[PDB]
Structure formats: structure tokens, C-alpha cells
């Protein structure tokens, strides 16, 4: 069980920029090292081996690096297509390890989220069960945090979120954030709030409706 | 050159089994070392194992000793692999590789779940109300309680793409998937444009269209 430990786990980079990627091994692995790059719905590609040999076909950008245990794939110049998922691999020893994998983003300016809050339906109410929906539209960076208030009272553990892949065209994120209450619940509060705090935000934004009609 | 086949998606009972297979062509089937490695969402590949076709001898991580057994059919040159008493944690995507290579499988993805198929039930996220806040508005539409995946969803047939943003689903602790699907669109629109949300479910052989409009306290 040689662990290959991988930092970071996430970073975002600009074209014409250089990424430095870090696997520290549990062991002494030698050069016995590979570098794989893999894409959503793909499987990996092989970019280096024996810690600094670049495999046929793969750009001169990519370079590797290390002997021991602290080895570094670094990519020079960025292009746009280097974005990815990116992991090292030891096969000095048996059983093979990976490390857990870098996911290069492409920076862009700070965008604030556009928030919006949906109250559950009429139909599915009908069914005992209420989905109240946060949709945080368009923002950059990534990190984001959405917490759910019911009559003011902060809700734990009720809730799943969804994220969308940078956009194509404008490299922002999308997010929704379902909370899943039981009807009886929902008709008890009056209250339902969406409190959003990005990077973007000056202060919290907060959307809020009260159940009536 | 080297091409390495496996199947697609696999969708098994927990406590059941499954064989994976890995097809190659393009090199002597009986040289080389086939491995084996599983891939779960964020969470690091593993190494399973390695077989020689040509002995069939074989070589196994000790974390899947007992719950991985590879094998080949060397007439076929097909590699095989088989996964025994699954539980969740055995849902991921499997691959077949060598050592450290550029030749991989495209994946099998397996699904363990004693969940039933199930089309969706398609509920309006029903744009805001009153006047608007930024002269935009955002509608779009929950699609949950449906298995196994996939969804598909469209807007007004295609006709609207600009501002669609439809979300991963997720495994909610039912056992049911959802996932929402939204378009952010002019509020000066919505008392001249239509918003209608075609979902899909293959696995199901259901589709329904919804339209999705503003709530009105006189409307029943």
C-alpha cells in the first residue's frame, strides 16, 4: 500500500502559464514513476514515464520530473486543451498506486452568482414530499456556499447540490441546491430562505419566499 | 495498433456478480500482461490485478483478493473479469491496461442498485413571480425519483440553448436519481414565449414534455 500522495487537488491556470503538479511517495519508488492525463467520459493518456521519459505524441510542454519519492509533472505554456484531470502512478512496487488526481480549470475574472429560489410545486406537494430549489447562475470561481434557513433556522443535512462543468464560452459554474423537506415540515414554516456567499458577493445574498397563496 | 474493447454500462443487484470483458486487437494477446483498475468519482484509481494470457497466471492487490477473479479465453483473445457478492461500493469504472500505458479500455461503467426502473416525475421550477430584480428571469424543470440513469432534457425542442444549464443527477438516499434543468431568459419574455422542457428517460422508453410558467393565485 504505497500511497502516492497528489497535490493540489484543484487549480486553475491562464493560457501561456505554467502548472506544477506534486506526488510525494510513501516509499522510495526510484524513477518507476508515469503521469497520466484523462478528460470527462475518457479514459487516461499516457504522458510520462519513468518520471522524466515524455511518451511519443505527447506536446514538449509537458515535462516530468523527480527520483526517491517526491516527483513533479509541470506544464509549460497551457493551452486550452490541458484542461483536465491529471494523476502520477508508482509501479515500483506491487500493488500499483495512483494519486488522487489534479483537476486543471481555466481562470477568468471574479463574477458574482445570480440567485434564484424556487418553492416547491403544487403537484409534487401532492405526493408528501417538498424540493425547494437555489439555483446560483453564471459565477467564477468555483467555490461557492449556499445555506438553507427556515424561519431563520439554519438547516443541516437536508440538502444536495449539483455543479456544472466551466462553460465554454464564458468559463463560469452553474450550481443548484435542493432541499428536501417532508410536506408536513414545509406547511408548518413560513419562511424559506437561499443565504449564498461567493468570492463575488460583497455581502451575503439572500433569496427568500414565504409559503402562502 | 493495440485496441483494447469492453462493454458499456452494467446494472447489478447488490450480492450478485458480474464478468467484464476486454477485447484486444492489434498485438500477440498472449504476450503481455493485461491489468486491471477501477476508478469511482473522485476517488484515485486502484490497481485490481495483472494476468498472462499465456499461463493464465495471475497476480492480485490484496484488497481485491477475495472479491476479483480474472481469467482470459485465449481462442478470443478476450480478458475477463469477474466481480463477486457486490455491494456499492463496488459501482465505479473498470479498465483494462497494462503496467503503465498509453493502451486502455474506454471503461465499463457498473452500477450496483436494488433499485427498480422507474420513468421521472417532471415538476415546474416556475419563474420567480411579481416584477423582476434584474430584468432576467430563471425557470426550468425537477426531474426526479427515476432510474437508472440516464436523462436527457432539451428546451421548447431544441429551439432554446442560450442559458441552459442542466445539472448532473444525483443518488438521493431513496435510491432514486434527480437532477433540474434551467434557462435563465428575458422576464419581459415570459408573457410571450412559451418554456417547454422535453425529457427524456431511455431506460424507461418515457418522454414527457412540460411546459413551465409563472404561478398564478387564480389558476387551479
Known amino acids: 500500500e504505497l500511497v502516492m500522495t497528489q497535490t493540489p487537488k484543484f487549480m486553475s491556470t491562464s493560457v501561456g502559464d505554467r502548472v506544477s503538479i506534486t506526488c510525494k511517495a510513501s516509499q522510495n519508488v526510484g524513477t518507476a514513476v508515469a503521469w497520466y492525463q484523462q478528460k470527462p467520459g475518457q479514459s487516461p493518456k499516457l504522458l510520462i514515464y519513468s518520471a522524466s521519459n515524455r511518451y511519443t505524441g505527447v506536446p514538449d510542454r509537458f515535462t516530468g520530473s523527480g527520483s526517491g519519492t517526491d516527483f513533479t509533472l509541470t506544464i509549460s505554456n497551457m493551452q486550452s486543451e490541458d484542461l483536465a484531470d491529471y494523476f502520477c502512478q508508482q509501479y515500483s512496487s506491487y500493488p500499483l498506486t495512483f494519486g488522487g488526481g489534479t483537476k486543471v480549470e481555466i481562470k477568468r475574472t471574479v463574477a458574482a452568482p445570480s440567485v434564484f429560489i424556487f418553492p416547491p410545486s403544487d403537484e409534487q406537494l401532492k405526493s408528501g414530499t417538498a424540493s425547494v430549489v437555489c439555483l446560483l447562475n453564471n459565477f467564477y470561481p468555483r467555490e461557492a456556499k449556499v445555506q438553507w434557513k427556515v424561519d431563520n433556522a439554519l438547516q443541516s443535512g437536508n440538502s444536495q447540490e449539483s455543479v456544472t462543468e466551466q462553460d465554454s464560452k464564458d468559463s463560469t459554474y452553474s450550481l443548484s441546491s435542493t432541499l428536501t423537506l417532508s410536506k408536513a415540515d414545509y406547511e408548518k414554516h413560513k419562511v424559506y430562505a437561499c443565504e449564498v456567499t461567493h468570492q463575488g458577493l460583497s455581502s451575503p445574498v439572500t433569496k427568500s419566499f414565504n409559503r402562502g397563496e | 495498433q493495440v485496441q483494447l474493447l469492453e462493454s458499456g454500462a452494467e446494472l447489478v443487484k447488490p450480492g450478485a456478480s458480474v464478468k467484464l470483458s476486454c477485447k484486444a486487437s492489434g498485438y500477440t494477446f498472449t504476450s503481455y500482461w493485461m491489468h486491471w483498475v477501477k476508478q469511482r468519482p473522485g476517488r484515485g484509481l486502484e490497481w485490481i490485478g495483472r494476468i498472462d494470457p499465456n499461463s493464465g497466471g495471475t497476480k492480485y492487490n490484496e484488497k481485491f483478493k477475495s472479491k476479483a477473479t480474472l481469467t482470459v479465453d485465449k481462442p478470443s483473445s478476450t480478458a475477463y473479469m469477474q466481480l463477486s457478492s457486490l455491494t456499492s461500493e463496488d459501482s465505479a469504472v473498470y479498465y483494462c491496461?497494462?503496467?503503465?500505458?498509453?493502451?486502455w479500455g474506454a471503461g465499463t461503467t457498473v452500477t450496483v442498485s436494488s433499485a427498480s426502473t422507474k420513468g421521472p416525475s417532471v415538476f415546474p421550477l416556475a419563474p420567480s413571480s411579481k416584477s423582476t430584480s434584474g430584468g432576467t428571469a430563471a425557470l426550468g424543470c425537477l426531474v426526479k425519483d427515476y432510474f437508472p440513469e440516464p436523462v436527457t432534457v432539451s428546451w421548447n425542442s431544441g429551439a432554446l440553448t442560450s442559458g441552459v444549464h442542466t445539472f448532473p443527477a444525483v443518488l438521493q438516499s431513496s435510491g432514486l436519481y434527480s437532477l433540474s434543468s434551467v434557462v435563465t431568459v428575458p422576464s419581459s419574455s415570459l408573457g410571450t414565449q412559451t418554456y417547454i422542457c422535453n425529457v427524456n428517460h431511455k431506460p424507461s422508453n418515457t418522454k414527457v414534455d412540460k411546459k413551465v410558467e409563472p404561478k398564478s393565485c387564480d389558476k387551479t
Open positions: 491496461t497494462r503496467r503503465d500505458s498509453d493502451y
